[PDB]
Design brief:
Layout (H helix, E strand, L loop, with lengths): L2 E3 L10 E5 L18 H9 L2 H7 L10 E5 L5 E5 L12 E4 L2 E6 L4 E4 L27 H4 L11 H9 L4 H13 L3 H31 L6 E6 L2 E6 L9 E2 L11 E4 L4 E4 L1 H4 L5 E3 L19 H6 E2 L4 E5 L9 E6 L5 H10 L4 H29 L12 H6 L4 H17 L3 E3 L13 E4 L11 E7 L14 H6 L6 H10 L5 E2 L4 E2 L2 H10 L5 E2 L9 E7 L8 E7 L5 E7 L17 H9 L5 E9 L6 H4 L2 H4 L4 E9 L6 H10 L3 E5 L7 H8 L7 E9 L8 E6 L22 E3 L5 H7 L5 H8 L2 E2 L4 H13 L4 E3 L7 H6 L17 E3 L7 H34 L12 H16 L25 H23 L22 H16 L14 H19 L3 H6 L7 H38 L6 H4 L3
The structure holds beryllium trifluoride ion and magnesium ion.
The site of magnesium ion has 6 residues, from loops.
Pfam families: Cation_ATPase_N, E1-E2_ATPase, P5-ATPase
Catalytic activity: ATP + H2O = ADP + phosphate + H(+)
EC number: 7.2.2.-
């Protein structure tokens, strides 16, 4: 065999592998053998390697191969090499591509994806609790390896060539060489140092930020592993499949590796990997799950899910110790194979400046014509042969300025610093300019909009005087004073505060996460719990009949200090309670209130009490459970909820103000996602909802029909044959799609169902990571640009597909986003949007200015190549150093405004609104230069330029006039082409830029009006007339006025005028279509 095609199911790649030996016996044209090119051939074949491979390697079978080459379906090429190890076949020939680790098979002569995955013959029969008896940490750790070591930025060269190395290098290097050959001492060095400093600074900054963020993601833990029948502590990075450890140990807080409980139980919280906001319980494996276990499965059935622990899931509680341990666990998948890991690896597999590429190619095309005409004129004047190339090739390096990327990078860093000054850290500087075109902002529910746990909302009390519920009573302070365990209020306070199996450790209890929050809601101090000292008596606890799967309630026998008798306090599930309680106490509104509080997403809990007169140390053990819950008295409801973060609503309001659509994408259920949306503002307060349900046939059938119904009032609907419009509070509505209906729609849709759904859909629930990324792709296909404020691994993949990615937890693997935040809130988005818009407008301003610079320079030179006399060699330097770089750099020294606006900056460079003002600025600048030149042509003397010689003489009156006019144009155009009040702070407010402009203009005025004689010789000036010296000032002033008035009024009007003359986004059509 000599080739192979894989099939990668986790991410569709279908890679192609082919093996090649190293150089031939004769390799005289190898990359370094082409030393005549040196680095040129290296550059040529670094990106496109087909010639590289055809030059070097020939086909060899995989048995004797020396390096393999990998080809995915993007037609993107890569080259890897095999490794070698001499023990268990006699050699593990293998390769590694994007963290997939492919093993050779000496028997069938093909590659395999880790031989699939292992199900050991010794493991999983009945009892794999023996442990790794002997040497099974060396003979088996070689195959599997350590736990999730990512990369150390393989070499600096890839980072340099990807993040920083712009395509402008070739012409820039040629320009530096030409200037070196043309006696440019100062400016070549200035350009080289500025570019090198900026690039090295960027590379070092990004490397250090990446290191700082990656070091925190290690999360290394310690575990008490069985080895050979002994108990030994070990680091978390020393585990292989078939190795037992223990869970009940207090020092453990996160599951090390994906596992399978064998003895005991536990309660865990899988929030981040799935999205559910409810803690889950686990149970052992009964020798039937072990046989029905294939670790290769992408997602398990319900049983094996019920017995697994997922790596990274937070451990809440375990069966406590009796010196021993009661929660052992087996290890099945370690490394990248873990479910949390597989998202990280599959994230990295898939690999505006093109406008600058267009400008570069157009400028090169124009430089061709300029070169042609310059050579024609030079050969017409038959000047010295050497001087028919150098000064006839400076045209190219002055029509394609090389100082552009440096100033763009500096302007970007002036915003990256402001971002890092607000606790927001950026790991990819390019995305800042993408922040100014966000037209949709997607969120997540658990962890970003709302806190990650359940919080008690209030207490409802079933009075005994009138069988009617009472108000919400959100605070215990009002609870204590309320009156009518004979009093139901106290019988509710006791059950909230006492009656729980909590084990306090450090003044804050640890245990089941439901009654804990209840305990802190009570606020008392904790086998007796005395009330807060700031009148409630002291409660005593005797014995607890705790939770049972069959009977959903728990009970406690308590004794008040003051009273002689005792009480039985029970807390349970309202579904089963009424058959226990005394029927003449239920307030007849039980069903309605329960249904109301359940159909909104909340969760409820019922309390009941029973007085018992005779209680002693004997009857406590004598009486069984049934007598405790024989007949009791209902008290009321304890209502949970999913609390919002305190500041989310204001941020959502401000985003809705500035005409930015918002949607919510979650993984929880829909019944609470709708209510969470309705509280904050994503859905309007009175807007209806509409859900699509299969009228007949599940997602299996391709012919199934879908009915779009309401939620609050069934039997009502909007159109299905498809209009997504109200059939037959009606102008506003929103569609909330489940997680399987969306899959069926994307599988089958008339392309109008999908589009109207995507325009109207607001609250998606039960969505999976692949569903999330397909949704983001469809969102971008209808011509959006959607940011994503995700926080967990469950939505890591989407964070890569979005245009702008934010994150809320740098600790976990959500570092995929180009951004990262250290203040966990939604208060992070408006700042990013503001900075993005300001950076966009500043980048366009600087780009237009630096592209007008070239035309100024070219016109000034071309008025002079008629007589073959350049500007000089020091006026060039003054213009290119003291005039451009200060103005161009300091024009980006500002910050964004404080408040958002409904407006939006332009985003397309080649549009008919960024280019027309530029060309008209050119057509006023050339007008004023040629005007001054004509003004000096006739009225003043000395106007003859010296006839052509071997050395192009440069002391004329056609040099000095077109040097001052050019200088004034540089300064004033730099002032005018600015970004002011609409998206930045007022220029008058910030001093650096305006003071730089003032000092430079004073310098020029001093050099013109009364020039020092030593400087009058240092440059090649010539004497002028007082009147003409005033005239130059007048020309500068009128350029200022004309440029300002045109830039604010004229050229935008002419833009629309020419657009209308030329008259002779897939969405924003559907909105009008469905306006009703
Ligand atoms: F925690 Be979220 F659902 F990504
Ligand atoms: Mg999550």
């Amino acid at each position: 065999r000599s080739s192979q095609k894989m099939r990668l199911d986790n991410d569709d790649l279908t890679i192609a592998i082919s093996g090649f030996i190293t150089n031939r016996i004769g390799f005289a044209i190898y990359i370094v053998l082409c030393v005549l090119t040196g680095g040129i051939a290296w550059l040529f074949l670094r990106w496109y390697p087909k010639y590289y491979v055809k030059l070097v390697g020939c086909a060899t079978p995989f048995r004797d191969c020396q390096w393999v080459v990998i080809e995915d379906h993007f037609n993107k090429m890569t080259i890897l090499s095999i490794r070698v190890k001499p023990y268990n076949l006699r050699e593990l020939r293998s390769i590694t591509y994007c963290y997939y680790k492919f093993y050779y098979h000496p028997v069938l002569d093909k590659f395999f994806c880790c031989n699939g995955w292992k199900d050991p013959q010794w493991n999983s029969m009945q009892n794999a609790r023996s442990g790794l008896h002997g040497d099974e940490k060396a003979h088996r750790e070689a195959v599997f390896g350590p736990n999730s070591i990512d990369v150390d930025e393989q070499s600096i060269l890839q980072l340099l060539v990807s993040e920083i190395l712009t395509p402008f290098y070739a012409f820039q290097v040629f320009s530096l060489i030409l200037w070196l050959c043309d006696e440019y001492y100062y400016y070549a060095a200035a350009i080289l140092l500025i570019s090198a400093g900026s690039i090295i600074t960027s590379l070092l900054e990004t490397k250090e930020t990446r290191r700082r963020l990656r070091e925190m993601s290690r999360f290394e833990c310690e575990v008490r592993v069985f080895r050979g029948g002994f108990w030994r502590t070990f680091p978390s990075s020393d585990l292989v499949p078939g190795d037992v450890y223990e869970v009940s140990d207090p020092s453990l807080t996160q599951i090390p590796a994906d596992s399978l409980l064998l003895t005991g139980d536990c309660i865990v919280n899988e929030s981040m990997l799935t999205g559910e906001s409810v803690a889950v319980s686990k149970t052992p494996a009964t020798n039937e799950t072990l046989a029905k276990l294939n670790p290769a499965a992408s997602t398990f059935s319900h049983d094996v899910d019920k017995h697994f622990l997922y790596c990274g899931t937070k451990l809440i509680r375990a069966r406590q110790r009796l010196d021993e341990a009661a929660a052992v666990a087996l290890v099945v998948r370690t490394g990248f194979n873990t479910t949390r890991g597989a998202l990280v690896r599959s994230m990295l597999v898939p690999k505006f400046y093109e406008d600058s590429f267009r400008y570069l190619k157009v400028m090169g095309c124009l430089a061709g014509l300029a070169f042609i005409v310059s050579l024609v004129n030079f050969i017409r004047l038959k000047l010295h042969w050497t001087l028919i190339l150098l000064r006839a090739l400076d045209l190219l390096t002055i029509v394609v300025p090389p100082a552009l990327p440096a100033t763009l990078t500096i302007g970007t860093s002036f915003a990256v610093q402001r971002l890092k000054g607000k606790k927001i850290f950026c790991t990819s500087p390019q995305r800042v300019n993408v922040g100014g075109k966000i037209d949709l902002m997607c969120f997540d529910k658990t962890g970003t909009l709302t806190e990650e746990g359940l919080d008690v909302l209030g207490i409802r009390v079933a009075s005994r005087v009138s069988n009617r519920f009472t108000e919400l009573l959100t605070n215990v302070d009002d609870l204590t004073w309320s009156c009518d365990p004979l009093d139901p209020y106290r019988a509710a306070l006791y059950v909230m505060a006492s009656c729980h199996s909590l084990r306090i450790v450090d003044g804050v209890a640890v245990g089941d996460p439901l009654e804990v929050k209840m305990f802190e809601f009570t606020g008392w101090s904790y086998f007796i719990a005395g009330e807060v000292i700031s009148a409630p008596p002291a409660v005593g606890v005797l014995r607890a009949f705790d939770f049972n799967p069959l009977l959903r309630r728990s009970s406690v026998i308590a004794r008040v200090v003051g009273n002689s008798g005792g009480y039985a306090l029970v807390k349970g599930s309202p579904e089963c309670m009424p058959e226990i309680c005394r029927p003449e106490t239920l307030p007849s509104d039980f069903d309605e209130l329960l249904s109301y509080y359940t159909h909104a997403g909340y969760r409820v809990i019922a309390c009941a009490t029973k007085r018992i007169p005779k209680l002693n140390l004997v009857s406590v053990n004598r009486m069984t459970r049934d007598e405790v819950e024989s007949g009791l008295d209902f008290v009321g409801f304890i209502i949970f909820e999913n609390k919002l973060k305190p500041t989310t609503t204001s941020v959502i309001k401000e985003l809705l103000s500035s005409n930015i659509g918002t949607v919510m994408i979650t993984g929880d259920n829909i019944r609470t996602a709708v209510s969470v949306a309705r509280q904050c503002g994503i859905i309007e307060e009175h807007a209806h909802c509409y859900m699509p349900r299969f009228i007949e046939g599940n997602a299996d059938d391709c012919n199934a029909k879908l009915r779009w119904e309401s939620i609050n009032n069934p039997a009502l609907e909007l159109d299905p044959t498809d209009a997504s419009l109200p059939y037959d509070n009606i102008r506003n509505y929103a569609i909330a799609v489940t997680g399987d209906v969306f899959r069926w729609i994307v599988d089958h849709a008339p392309t109008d169902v999908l589009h109207r759904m995507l325009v109207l859909g607001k609250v998606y629930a039960r969505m999976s990571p692949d569903e999330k990324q397909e949704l983001v792709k469809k969102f971008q296909s209808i011509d959006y640009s959607c940011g994503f404020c995700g926080d967990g691994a469950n939505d890591c993949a989407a964070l890569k597909a979005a245009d702008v990615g934010i994150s809320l937890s740098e600790a976990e693997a959500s570092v995929a986003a180009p951004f990262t935040s250290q203040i966990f809130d939604i208060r992070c988005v408006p700042e990013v949007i503001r900075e993005g818009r300001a950076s966009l407008v500043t980048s366009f301003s600087c780009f237009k200015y630096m592209s007008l610079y070239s035309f100024i320079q070219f016109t000034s030179v071309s008025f002079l190549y008629v007589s073959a006399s350049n500007l000089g060699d020091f006026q060039f330097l003054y213009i290119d150093l003291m005039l451009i770089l200060p103005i161009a750099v300091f024009m980006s020294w500002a910050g964004p405004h404080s408040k958002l606006c409904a407006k939006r900056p332009v985003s397309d460079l080649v549009s008919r609104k960024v280019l027309v003002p530029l060309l008209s600025h050119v057509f006023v600048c050339v007008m004023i230069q040629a005007l001054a030149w004509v003004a000096v042509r006739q009225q003043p003397w000395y106007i003859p330029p010296i006839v052509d010689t071997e050395k192009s003489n440069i002391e004329n009156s056609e040099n000095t006039t077109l040097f001052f006019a050019s200088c004034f144009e540089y300064i004033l155009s730099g002032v005018v082409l600015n970004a002011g009040r609409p998206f930045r702070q007022s220029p008058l407010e910030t001093w650096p830029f305006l003071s730089a402009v003032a000092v430079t203009l004073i310098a020029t005025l001093l050099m013109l009006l009364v020039p020092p004689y030593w400087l009058f010789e240092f440059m090649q000036l010539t004497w002028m007339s007082w009147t003409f010296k005033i005239t130059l000032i007048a020309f500068g002033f009128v350029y200022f006025l004309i440029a300002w008035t045109g830039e604010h009024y004229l050229f935008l009007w002419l833009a629309r005028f020419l657009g209308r003359m030329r008259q002779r986004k897939q969405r924003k059509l559907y909105k009008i279509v469905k306006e009703k």
